[PDB]
Design a protein around this ligand. Structure first.
Ligand SMILES: COc1cc2c(cc1OC)[C@H](Cc1c[nH]c3c(Cl)cccc13)N(C=O)CC2
Ligand SMILES: COc1cc2c(cc1OC)[C@H](Cc1c[nH]c3c(Cl)cccc13)N(C=O)CC2
Ligand SMILES: [Mg+2]
Ligand SMILES: [Mg+2]
Ligand SMILES: [Zn+2]
Ligand SMILES: [Zn+2]
Lengths: 326, 323
């Protein structure tokens, strides 16, 4: 229980960007999603607010965590835990104080926890091009993200797993709609449109008497939560470098395994997936320049100046990867 | 037979005796009408479809329409197929659509309601059904019709697209998905709005033939075409229309009985103890069907005139049955 001692100390960092999430995964016996979600629910008093029985919460979290694949290098329970914790920090930004209801906060955190559950470690395009059962089920449209939702919600029906048992019917209906809207927005094929829309919101931003964002209709509220969880999902390059490099190692392993399957099938290999013609560093610089920095610069503008340190880390990490190329 | 062959000679006419064909074919209207249309359009030779594969697939697809559902069954599928087939021949749409596009619209029509349980998307969502859980409350039925229609191609000797090339299959699949998802009635208003916009910006030859240069406009027309076909019952000869009304009302009343037995709020038009069938048809025509078909008729002006005339006659008749 020295191990439990150290785990408890590490979970004291749950409100901090840069949590030692890989250490928590080891110290908790490969239960980072369970222990980080439980910590955040206690920190936000969500069990009391929503009358969630503790044993039900733990049972659901352990079953949800079990349905992430332990043999996928990137899209596994550690990624889920990281996106949950990152969403939890973004929800606490001063520019959003008292903006979201407890139900919206619960939706964003739950959506983050389930948002990649049962991910097979290959992309939507691979699933479509190989005529997979998932792509047949979902008509080639947000194939993975529709699946993550269906699994995350189906698991609430397992024994002693219904963590929403004491919500009203209107609360359950609202939560389900918001969770669906959020997880579907994590489909990377939606990124350009989602960013375009966020830029429009920044350009037309309204702030209250108190200085917080004014969001007075469902469309604006859900758009901010969609972009919040998308930013959390695309947060690896904004983390301290020792965390970022481990995430890069993991995504490259997953990509290379996909590319090996493409090469064996005689398919064209997807970008970044060819281990015999990879440039890992150039790929991260491009990822930051074309995707991650445009997104995070816009989020930082929305909540200015709250996210300045995050943006500074992203820019430093870009400079570091760039410097390894020449 | 023989009478069935005589009935099928009207395959190119609005008002085919589809119920008679259902009876004469041993409850195989979808198979015999699809087979007839693939011949009339030379689609088996154009796409190198083996006739036995075609028949095997059609019989399997038709088997996955429910025979105990009064409206959304194989006779409705056959009717929508044949209606699309006629609309594809609107003179104003001449030279617009490729043969792959024609194949996609016809195939989409055939599968567009397969495995329909006879209850609405809202019912499926509110009863927390397995389908709504699978599809995240979004176009629940239409996603399932697609998934079943395509999965059945994988049954033994059922792949009617086996000799399409790789790109053709991918393009057909995309178009079919885009068309069937557009048949979700919750999308009607947006679809009609886009049809109106196309009518306003419409470009035609000197003889009034539609010019549609981009895929977006062409798939919108195919979406509205199959939606018109899906909503064509009130434009058919009255003896046909009244049978479709009887069937949809039975299906609605059965859904309302389930909603009552479960203690749910009964859906509009679904309460057999508080129904006005005729007023509901007049409202359906006034608010949904006639705006849609008037816009279609403007897009193809004036080739839809006879269809629109029948719709207007039928509206007048149903109104006269209200005291
Ligand atoms: C640490 O490094 C990485 C992490 C991740 C990715 C790529 C990384 O490094 C190049 C890709 C991003 C992505 C793929 N397609 C996209 C489209 Cl189409 C739009 C936006 C983002 C993406 N991911 C999953 O595949 C998410 C995690
Ligand atoms: C013969 O008479 C009928 C036939 C049909 C319907 C209604 C009829 O008579 C009132 C409804 C129409 C419909 C239901 N919700 C809609 C929405 Cl939300 C928008 C547009 C149309 C609809 N259908 C399916 O349920 C299609 C067939
Ligand atoms: Mg994902
Ligand atoms: Mg339908
Ligand atoms: Zn993710
Ligand atoms: Zn239909």
């Amino acid at each position: 229980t020295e191990q439990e001692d150290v785990l408890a100390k590490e979970l004291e960092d749950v409100n901090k960007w840069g949590l030692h999430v890989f250490r928590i995964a080891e110290l908790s016996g490969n239960r980072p999603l369970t222990v980080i979600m439980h910590t955040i629910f206690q920190e936000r008093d969500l069990l009391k607010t929503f009358k969630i029985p503790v044993d039900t919460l733990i049972t659901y979290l352990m079953t949800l965590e079990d349905h992430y694949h332990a043999d996928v290098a990137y899209h596994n329970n550690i990624h889920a835990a990281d996106v949950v914790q990152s969403t939890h920090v973004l929800l606490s930004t001063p520019a959003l104080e008292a903006v979201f209801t407890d139900l919206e906060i619960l939706a964003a955190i739950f959506a983050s926890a389930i948002h990649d559950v049962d991910h097979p470690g290959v992309s939507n395009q691979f699933l479509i091009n190989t005529n997979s059962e998932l792509a047949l089920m979902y008509n080639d449209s947000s194939v993975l993200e529709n699946h993550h939702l269906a699994v995350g919600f189906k698991l609430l029906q397992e024994e002693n797993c219904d963590i929403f048992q004491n919500l009203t019917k209107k609360q359950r209906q609202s939560l389900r709609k918001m969770v669906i809207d959020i997880v579907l927005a994590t489909d990377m094929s939606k990124h350009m449109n989602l960013l375009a829309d966020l830029k429009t919101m920044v350009e037309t931003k309204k702030v209250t008497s108190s200085g917080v964002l004014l969001l007075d209709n469902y469309s604006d509220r859900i758009q901010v939560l969609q972009n919040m969880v998308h930013c959390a999902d695309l947060s690896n390059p904004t983390k301290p470098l020792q965390l970022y490099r481990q995430w890069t190692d993991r995504i490259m392993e997953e990509f290379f395994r996909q590319g090996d399957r493409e090469r064996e099938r005689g398919m064209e290999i997807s970008p970044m997936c060819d281990k015999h013609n990879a440039s890992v560093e150039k790929s991260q610089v491009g990822f930051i320049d074309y995707i991650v920095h445009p997104l995070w610069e816009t989020w930082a503008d929305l909540v200015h100046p709250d996210a300045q340190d995050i943006l500074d880390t992203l820019e430093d990490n870009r400079e570091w990867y760039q410097s390894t190329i020449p």
